Design an enzyme around this catalytic site. Structure first.
Site, mmCIF file in Angstrom:
data_model
loop_
_atom_site.group_PDB
_atom_site.id
_atom_site.type_symbol
_atom_site.label_atom_id
_atom_site.label_comp_id
_atom_site.label_asym_id
_atom_site.label_seq_id
_atom_site.Cartn_x
_atom_site.Cartn_y
_atom_site.Cartn_z
ATOM 1 C CD1 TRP A 43 3.641 46.591 41.080
ATOM 2 C CD2 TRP A 43 4.820 45.254 39.670
ATOM 3 N NE1 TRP A 43 4.023 47.367 40.011
ATOM 4 C CE2 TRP A 43 4.772 46.596 39.142
ATOM 5 C CE3 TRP A 43 5.501 44.263 38.922
ATOM 6 C CZ2 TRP A 43 5.352 46.937 37.885
ATOM 7 C CZ3 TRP A 43 6.117 44.653 37.708
ATOM 8 C CH2 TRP A 43 6.050 45.989 37.234
ATOM 9 C CG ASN A 167 9.159 47.259 37.025
ATOM 10 O OD1 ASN A 167 9.154 46.646 35.928
ATOM 11 N ND2 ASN A 167 8.580 48.496 37.180
ATOM 12 C CD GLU A 168 10.160 49.711 33.367
ATOM 13 O OE1 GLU A 168 9.963 50.911 33.782
ATOM 14 O OE2 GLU A 168 9.647 49.341 32.242
ATOM 15 C CE1 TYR A 250 5.086 50.366 28.187
ATOM 16 C CE2 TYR A 250 7.204 49.578 29.043
ATOM 17 C CZ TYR A 250 5.844 49.510 29.000
ATOM 18 O OH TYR A 250 5.141 48.671 29.834
ATOM 19 C CD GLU A 287 6.926 46.609 32.162
ATOM 20 O OE1 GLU A 287 6.634 47.733 31.681
ATOM 21 O OE2 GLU A 287 7.248 46.474 33.325
ATOM 22 C CD1 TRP A 320 1.422 48.788 30.854
ATOM 23 C CD2 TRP A 320 2.632 47.488 32.248
ATOM 24 N NE1 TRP A 320 1.194 49.249 32.140
ATOM 25 C CE2 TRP A 320 1.934 48.486 33.021
ATOM 26 C CE3 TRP A 320 3.500 46.568 32.919
ATOM 27 C CZ2 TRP A 320 2.054 48.580 34.413
ATOM 28 C CZ3 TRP A 320 3.589 46.692 34.366
ATOM 29 C CH2 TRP A 320 2.896 47.702 35.075
#
Length: 363
Positions: A43, A167-168, A250, A287, A320
């Protein structure tokens, strides 16, 4: 010049490289080098006064304030911590992907920008001129920042492999995908105007938007295939100022059943590499994770997914997350940063760490 410590790769993620101590930062990078992990995604943001106070680390506490506010003392400057991380990464030969805002509220994120500017919906971040201007101001400050340990501004630093926009990022209020595409075009083009040296990636999870011939394994997590989040990966990956595609994975969070985690992830990987190869751009699984408490063999799922990325010509696979030694109230029964989310891997004798070492040699 060279990085003293130093294409396809095994990589990983670590979110605390901009606010933890030198001992904890050195531990993550030394683990990455020892394991053969070539790229670490980190980050590069800390937005909002409460978030900065909570970590005693400042990057972007208020609009137009970068680093530590005048008048706060005994605080860390997140740019100095990111400087340390980047200088140590150079020494250890680790390439970095630095992400510039979070979709989520951890470390403030898009909602912190919307609060500063009085909006009422997360997605105002993509739409309101005043918010876009503050993101551009912050990105320009960061890319032009001179690293206090090297003398080299981030714009000219070769240990940084890529900037990543967000991010995302999701935009559920525009399921056509167009609002996100327009914002990614504007911001990827703006970063290329600031920095002619580095790659730019988006940082999205890779969702599809109802493409003919692409359906989810087992009918599960259909929203990741049907455009619910406002992410249209094909349209994003076609943007001229985006250099490589990103996707995340995920299945436990996305509603897949445990007996289907492996095959759902496999189809997801196959589908993304197929689309990236037809577009003709590199693709990174940036990730992925299965929770330690899943009732399936996590190591064998990670082995399947890494084998697929390797065999199908994907450019990178990044788990991740990687952690190292801990301190203070972030230290577990073995002295490591704790496994708070169930995804942590450390440089030990776990079957996951052994698998990552194995694949780091293959990539």
């Amino acid at each position: 010049h060279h990085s003293s410590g130093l294409f396809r790769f095994i990589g990983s993620n670590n979110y605390y490289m901009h606010y933890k101590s030198n001992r904890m930062i050195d531990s993550v990078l030394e683990s990455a080098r020892d394991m053969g992990i070539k790229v670490l995604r980190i980050w590069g943001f800390l937005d909002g006064e409460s978030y900065c106070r909570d970590k005693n680390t400042y990057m972007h506490p208020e609009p137009g304030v970068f680093g530590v506010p005048e008048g706060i003392s005994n605080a860390q400057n997140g740019f100095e911590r990111l400087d340390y991380t980047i200088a140590k990464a150079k020494e250890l030969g680790i390439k970095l992907i630095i992400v510039l805002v979070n979709n989520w509220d951890d470390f403030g994120g898009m909602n912190q920008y919307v609060r500063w500017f009085g909006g009422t919906h997360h997605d105002d971040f993509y739409r309101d001129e005043r918010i876009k201007e503050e993101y551009k101001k912050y990105v320009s400050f960061l890319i032009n920042h001179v690293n206090v340990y090297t003398g080299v501004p981030y714009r000219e630093e070769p240990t940084i492999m890529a900037w990543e926009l967000a991010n995302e990022l999701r935009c559920e209020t525009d399921k056509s995908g167009n609002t996100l595409v327009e914002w990614v075009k504007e911001m990827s083009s703006y970063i290329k105007s600031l920095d002619p040296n580095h790659l730019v990636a988006v940082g999205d999870e890779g969702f599809f938007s109802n493409y003919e011939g692409f359906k989810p394994y087992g009918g599960e997590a259909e929203w990741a295939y049907n455009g619910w989040s406002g992410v249209d990966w094909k349209k994003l990956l076609s943007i001229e100022t985006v250099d490589f595609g990103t996707f995340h994975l995920y299945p436990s969070h996305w509603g897949v059943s445990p007996e289907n985690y492996a095959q759902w992830g496999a189809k997801w990987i196959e589908d993304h590499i197929k689309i990236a190869k037809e577009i003709g751009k590199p693709v990174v699984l940036e990730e992925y994770g299965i929770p330690k408490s899943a009732p399936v063999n996590r190591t064998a799922i990670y082995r399947l997914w890494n084998d697929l990325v390797y065999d199908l010509g994907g450019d990178g696979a990044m788990f991740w997350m990687l952690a190292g030694i801990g301190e203070g109230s972030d230290r577990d029964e073995r002295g490591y940063y704790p496994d708070y989310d169930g995804f942590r891997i450390v440089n030990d004798d776990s079957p996951e760490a052994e698998l990552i070492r194995e694949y780091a040699k293959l990539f």
